[PDB]
Structure formats: C-alpha cells, structure tokens
Amino acid sequence: GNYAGNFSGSSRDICLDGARLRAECRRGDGGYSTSVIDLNRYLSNDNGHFRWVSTATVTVQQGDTLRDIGRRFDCDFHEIARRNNIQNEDLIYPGQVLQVGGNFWDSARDVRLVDGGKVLEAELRYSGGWNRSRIYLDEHIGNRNGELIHC
Numbered sequence: 102g103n104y105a106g107n108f109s110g111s112s113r114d115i116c117l118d119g120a121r122l123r124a125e126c127r128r129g130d131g132g133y134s135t136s137v138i139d140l141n142r143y144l145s146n147d148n149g150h151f152r153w154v155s156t157a158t159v160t161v162q163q164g165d166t167l168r169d170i171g172r173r174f175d176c177d178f179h180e181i182a183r184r185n186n187i188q189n190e191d192l193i194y195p196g197q198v199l200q201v202g203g204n205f206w207d208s209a210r211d212v213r214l215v216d217g218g219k220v221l222e223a224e225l226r227y228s229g230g231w232n233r234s235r236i237y238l239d240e241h242i243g244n245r246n247g248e249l250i251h252c
C-alpha cells in the first residue's frame with residue numbers, strides 16, 4: 102500500500118542544510134511554515150546503503166542474538182557490533198544497552214536531493230569503498246500541520 106510519509110505532496114522549496122531537510126510546508130489553516138527535520142536522526146549508512154533506522158537504544162533480552170536484533174531493526178549487525186564495541190559478535194548479555202540507528206552523515210559524501218526533492222542520494226562508505234545509494238524520502242517523512250515529522 103501507500104508510503105506512510107508523503108510530505109512531498111504538501112511541501113515545496115525542498116532543501117538540504119547539511120543533513121537537515123528543510124521545506125515550506127502547508128499548514129491545516131491555509132498558511133505555510135518553514136520546517137526542518139534532521140535526517141541524521143532517521144537514516145543509517147548500512148554498509149553502503151541507505152536504511153531507515155531511528156536513533157534509539159535497545160536492551161538485550163535473554164535468548165536474543167545480534168542477528169535477531171539486526172533483523173528486528175533492519176541493519177548490519179556487524180556495525181551494531183563495532184558501534185557498541187562488542188568483542189565477540191556471538192556474545193551479548195541480557196540488560197546490555199545497544200545504541201542503534203541514524204548517523205549516515207558521518208560516512209556519506211556528494212549528498213544531494215534529486216527528483217524534485219523526493220529522493221536523497223549520496224556516496225556511502227562500505228567495506229571496500231564508496232557506493233552510490235538513493236532513498237525515497239516520502240517513505241517515512243511526513244507533514245503534520247506544517248511540521249516535518251518521521252512516520
């Protein structure tokens with residue numbers, strides 16, 4: 102079915118201010134706002150590929166594996182491991198607090214909007230070089246009463 106975001110139908114002059122997405126957004130009342138959303142909070146660089154992963158923490162439960170958590174959050178468990186300085190990817194412990202999500206900007210270059218502001222593209226660092234990647238921002242960026250929000 103539809104994307105959940107669809108900000109682009111109700112927004113114009115879509116711009117990037119570094120990792121921050123800015124637009125003139127329509128408000129319920131016929132007026133306009135200028136709103137910004139920090140895309141570095143919502144997009145990860147998943148070994149060379151844009152992935153929607155919200156900056157968050159996850160507490161390990163008994164029986165979890167890094168693969169399962171990888172699957173639950175859609176991301177390379179190898180990077181979860183490095184980012185959280187995990188000595189052995191097969192050893193995690195209940196109550197362990199793992200940082201996940203965001204942070205694409207730190208390993209991106211040539212970042213720009215294409216397709217009338219609907220698509221973000223970048224060269225993203227991977228284990229072996231730089232990969233060109235694009236992501237449809239309407240998937241998860243929405244306009245609620247003139248504010249850009251993740252949904």
Ligand SMILES: CC(=O)N[C@@H]1[C@@H](O)[C@H](O[C@@H]2O[C@H](CO)[C@@H](O[C@@H]3O[C@H](CO)[C@@H](O[C@@H]4O[C@H](CO)[C@@H](O)[C@H](O)[C@H]4NC(C)=O)[C@H](O)[C@H]3NC(C)=O)[C@H](O)[C@H]2NC(C)=O)[C@@H](CO)O[C@H]1O
Binds near residue numbers: 161162164165167193
């Ligand atoms: C990348 C990936 O996903 N790899 C998978 C492997 O992880 C998985 O093997 C299983 O992995 C889990 C999670 O690490 C593991 O469970 C952990 O096991 C250790 C014991 O070795 C427990 O350690 C103890 O914890 C308690 C407190 O919580 C301490 O008091 C105690 O001292 C610790 N013991 C030691 C020796 O230090 C962890 O608590 C426990 N963690 C969780 C989250 O339950 C399983 O034992 C692994 N299972 C097997 C069969 O090896 C592998 C197979 O499932 O699959 C890979 O894909």
